[PDB]
Ligand binder design. Structure first.
Ligand code: ANP
Ligand code: SMI
Ligand code: MG
Ligand code: MG
Length: 258
């Protein structure tokens, strides 16, 4: 997608306001929209803070409505994948690890939502990472700056969430659908574990590529190119090369000490 993003952004915030205006504290645009800039496959990352949990019916109304504002990756030249994370004030302030996520919407749910599966509130270790990103780079579309609203996420909580995330990826079906992002996410986790910082997918990829034995450099170079829209994503082609990359990078992450 190469289209100006302000139209779809205003549609998505209109849906959020329509359901949540009376309990809304903040809407923050974050992720690559604010840090590095949207690339052809980039989603729109929104973080919504409410003062009270949602009624079940409000969860379903909002999830259904958000799906109508969103397009499956590669199915639209004008609409990006939309991602909305809702946190309840008293669940995330004061900061505790791990924290409860009230709601998340994203295109990975499309099938579920169309079958009437509405994901309920859960522990989400990923909030340690999302709130660290949002506090550093975001736009308050409404309410206070992320920096002021959210407590700092301790670096030990960041470090633990980065290492725990690696439990998701052990064998090839665990990354079957999502080969480019698992590769770029491994590079970002490795980068963040050594640096304590967060980098866009291409910056983390180039950092990783410097620090890899030459055998592992090709898979991350292909992922970095596909992220920038420069080359095709043919990472599923080279299945064995992918799993060796994953095992190699996980081992290198595991070596990084706190
Ligand atoms: N070290 C890390 N840095 C960044 N994101 C990370 C890291 N570790 C795990 N993640 C998760 O990776 C996901 C990235 O969100 P996503 O919207 O795909 O990223 P982005 O920076 O906006 N880039 P993109 O949408 O591809 O342009 C989130 O769930 C993050 O918390
Ligand atoms: C909260 N961050 C998101 C989640 O990690 C999510 N998967 C549970 C990610 O899924 C993705 O990698 C990508 O980025 C999504 C992330 O932005 O979002 C695409 C629509 C689907 C995907 O599978 O390609
Ligand atoms: Mg994004
Ligand atoms: Mg996202």
């Amino acid at each position: 997608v190469i289209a100006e993003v302000s139209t779809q952004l205003s549609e998505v915030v209109g849906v959020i306001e329509r359901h949540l205006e009376p309990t809304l504290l903040a809407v923050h645009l974050y992720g690559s929209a604010v840090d590095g800039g949207l690339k052809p496959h980039s989603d729109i990352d929104l973080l919504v803070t409410v003062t009270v949990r949602l009624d079940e019916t409000t969860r379903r109304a909002l999830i259904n409505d958000l799906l109508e504002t969103s397009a499956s990756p590669g199915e639209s030249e004008i609409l990006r994948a939309v991602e909305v994370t809702i946190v309840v004030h008293d669940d995330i302030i004061p900061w505790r690890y791990p924290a409860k996520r009230e709601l998340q919407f994203g295109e990975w749910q499309r099938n579920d939502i169309l079958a009437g599966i509405f994901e309920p509130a859960t522990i989400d270790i990923d909030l340690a990472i999302l709130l660290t990103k949002a506090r550093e780079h975001s736009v308050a579309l409404v309410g206070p700056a992320a920096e002021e609203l959210f407590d700092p996420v301790p670096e030990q909580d960041l470090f633990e969430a980065l290492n725990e995330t690696l439990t998701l990826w052990n064998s090839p079906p665990d990354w079957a659908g999502d080969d480019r992002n698992v590769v770029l996410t491994l590079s970002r986790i490795w980068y963040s574990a050594v640096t304590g910082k967060i980098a866009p997918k291409d910056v983390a990829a180039d950092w990783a590529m410097e620090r890899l034995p030459a055998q592992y450099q090709p898979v991350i170079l292909e992922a970095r190119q596909a992220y920038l829209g420069n080359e095709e994503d043919r990472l599923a082609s080279r299945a064995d090369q992918l799993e060796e990359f994953v095992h190699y990078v996980k081992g290198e992450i595991t070596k990084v000490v706190g």
